[PDB]
């Protein structure tokens, strides 16, 4: 009263695991072979009946494509998102991921060819472009690889200016769109320390501030003689301002 | 004889012989005041050989006197002191201002011959004339090391990003009736960078006619092109010649 090995079903292999004798009421499920998927709603199993007789079963496996190809730009739409049965002719549709945008000129759909291969995918979903980085007063924005989603940009300040803020920004996905990670930094003028006053001399047209390359010219009072260069200059190595040298001196 | 011998001795005077030893009648000999002495005007300074081998009568005619007034750069002598040589002790000479100096009213332009036959110490009665205010230089500076009086000097320079055109210095010279700066104020032109470079498959945003120190040019890539590099470049002006900070960006298709 024990059934032998289940019948032979084309493109399917019964899950014995790993018996030989199956007691009555024993339900054996068949699994479709590679490149085959069970046709929905069809009998895929048998059962040991009275008389050591297995129930009846017939071909339930049709040729089908592998689960659609995973793409970075687009995700599958329902119900394809949970389907496994893709008989030749099956057409699936994708929906742009975040943050990508649809390309009007192309189909977000794929077709299951006769060779069980999904049709070549195009760029139906492209990277969303980030806002124009803008401009940094007395600074520069380095765009090494565009400004689209995932892009990075670095910042720098021209000579004589110190950078205040982030040195870079990434085009990350922000809510409903792609947004720069960090805001534009600031390039603030580097100022030299107050020029030195000298004994018996003055500074001609003294100023409030002194930035890179600006200068101060001294003048000895009446009766005194200048010893040294008349002027010094604000040098700005290295994000800190410093006078070129020492002020002249006035000998009476 | 009919002939005289050596003329008589005169204090502070030495007769111009010479080196004659005999003098025929009518011969006239003049005496010459010794050092520190000058002949008193309207006074007989010579003798003649009279009959009887006798020299005419002569009396002291030399008075002590200071030398010719001191030479000054500020002032010169007025008339008639200008041509005078007779400066008895206690004599006062007046000076007038030279070009280009001016009078210091509170100061005496007069000098006096002291007992030791020297000139009274002079004072600054003739001051140096001032020069007009140098003024200013647009985008430049004027270095005035030692005032703006007669003989003064000033130099010129341009601010970062500008180039001096003209004189580099100016002297306060005497011009006709006063003192005037030898050279006019130079000009501080503006260094322009060479026209920015055009880039393949890209454009320059809001291109300008001229770019000066620090001015920036923004680049933009055409449709379907990718930017690889800096977004903008600026004009750097080392060193009286302008040059772009770096290379423009690439617009990769």
The burial of B71, by beta-carbon neighbours within 10 Å (0-12 exposed, 13-18 middle, 19 or more buried), is given as exposed
User: Domain check: are B148 and B95 in the same one?
Assistant: no
Domain span at residue A108? 64-127
User: Domain check: are B197 and B186 in the same one?
Assistant: no
User: Which residues of B fall within a CB distance of 8 Å from A226?
Assistant: 145
Cα B88 to Cα B66: distance, rounded to the nearest angstrom: 7
Q: For residue B20, what are the contacts with CB-CB under 8 A and spacing of at least 6?
A: none
User: Domain check: are B186 and B199 in the same one?
Assistant: no
Q: CATH number of the domain that A95 lies in? A: 2.10.70.10
Chain A 133-162, residues with CB within 8 Å of chain B CB atoms? 133, 135, 138, 140-147, 158-159
Number of domains in chain A: 4
Cα B104 to Cα B150: distance, rounded to the nearest angstrom: 15
User: Domain check: are B123 and B87 in the same one?
Assistant: yes
The residue among A172, A190, A208 that closes a domain is A190
Whether residue A168 contacts residue A182, with contact meaning beta carbons closer than 8 Å, is answered with yes
The residue among A63, A83, A101 that closes a domain is A63
User: Domain check: are B109 and B70 in the same one?
Assistant: yes
User: Domain check: are A87 and A57 in the same one?
Assistant: no
By the CB < 8 Å criterion, does B108 face chain A? Answer: no
Helices (H) and strands (E) in chain A, counts: 0, 25
The residue among A157, A190, A223 that closes a domain is A190
What is the count of residue pairs from A and B with beta carbons less than 8 Å apart? 58
User: Domain check: are B136 and B123 in the same one?
Assistant: no
User: Which residues of A fall within a CB distance of 8 Å from B234?
Assistant: 140, 158
| Other beta carbons less than 10 A from residue A194's beta carbon | 12
Tokens of A27: 């339900």
Structure-determination approach: X-ray
**Of B90, B199, B181, B102, the residue nearest B144 (C-alpha):** B181
Angstroms from A127 CA to nearest CA on chain B: 13
Cα B151 to Cα B130: distance, rounded to the nearest angstrom: 9
User: Domain check: are A172 and A208 in the same one?
Assistant: no
Which of A142, A147, A219 lies closest to B144 in CB terms? A219
User: Domain check: are B1 and B60 in the same one?
Assistant: yes
Q: For residue A37, what are the contacts with CB-CB under 8 A and spacing of at least 6?
A: A61, A62, A64, A84, A85, A86
Q: What is the largest CA-CA distance in chain B?
A: 136
Cα B149–chain centre separation: 10
By the CB < 8 Å criterion, does B250 face chain A? Answer: no
- Residue B145 to residue A214, Cβ atoms within 8 A: no
Is the dihedral angle over the CA atoms B107, B111, B112, B116 positive or is it negative? positive
By the CB < 8 Å criterion, does A213 face chain B? Answer: yes
Residue of B nearest to A215 (CA): B159
User: Which residues of B fall within a CB distance of 8 Å from A222?
Assistant: 146-147
| H/E element, B222 | none
* CA distances for B151 relative to B67, B125, B170, B192, angstroms: 30, 18, 10, 37
By the CB < 8 Å criterion, does B234 face chain A? Answer: yes
Most B CBs within 10 Å, among A142, A180, A231, A251, to test the B interface? A142
- Residue B228 to residue A145, Cβ atoms within 8 A: yes
Is the dihedral angle over the CA atoms B100, B102, B107, B111 positive or is it negative? positive
Residue of B nearest to A212 (CA): B160
User: Domain check: are A58 and A7 in the same one?
Assistant: yes
Which of B145, B218, B245 lies closest to A135 in CB terms? B218
Residues in chain B: 253
User: Domain check: are A73 and A99 in the same one?
Assistant: yes
User: Domain check: are B153 and B183 in the same one?
Assistant: yes
What is the DSSP code (8-state) at residue B119?
A: B
Cα B173–chain centre separation: 6
Cα A76 to Cα A56: distance, rounded to the nearest angstrom: 37
The burial of A48, by beta-carbon neighbours within 10 Å (0-12 exposed, 13-18 middle, 19 or more buried), is given as buried
């Amino acid at each position: 009263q024990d059934c032998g090995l289940p019948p032979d079903v084309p493109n399917a292999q019964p899950a014995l695991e790993g018996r030989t004798s199956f007691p009555e009421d024993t339900v054996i499920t068949y699994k479709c072979e590679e490149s085959f998927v069970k046709i929905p709603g069809e009998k895929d199993s048998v059962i040991c009946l009275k008389g050591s007789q297995w129930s009846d079963i017939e071909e339930f496996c049709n040729r089908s494509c592998e689960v659609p190809t995973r793409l970075n730009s687009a995700s599958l739409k329902q119900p394809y998102i949970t389907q496994n049965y893709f008989p030749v002719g099956t057409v699936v549709e994708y929906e742009c991921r975040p943050g990508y945008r649809r390309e009007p000129s192309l189909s977000p759909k794929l077709t299951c060819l006769q060779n069980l291969k999904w049709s070549t995918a195009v760029e139906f979903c492209k990277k969303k472009s980030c806002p124009n980085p803008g401009e940094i007063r007395n600074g520069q924005i380095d765009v090494p690889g565009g400004i689209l989603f995932g892009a990075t940009i670095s910042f720098s300040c021209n000579t004589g200016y110190k950078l205040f803020g982030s040195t870079s920004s990434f085009c990350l996905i922000s809510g409903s769109s792609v947004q720069w990670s960090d805001p534009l930094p600031e390039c603030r003028e580097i100022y030299c320390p107050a020029p030195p006053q000298i004994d018996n001399g003055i500074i001609q047209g003294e100023r409030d501030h002194y930035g890179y390359r600006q200068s101060v010219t001294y003048a000895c009072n009446k009766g005194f003689t200048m010893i040294g260069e008349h002027s010094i200059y604000c040098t700005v190595n290295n994000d800190e301002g410093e006078w070129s040298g020492p002020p002249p001196e006035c000998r009476g």
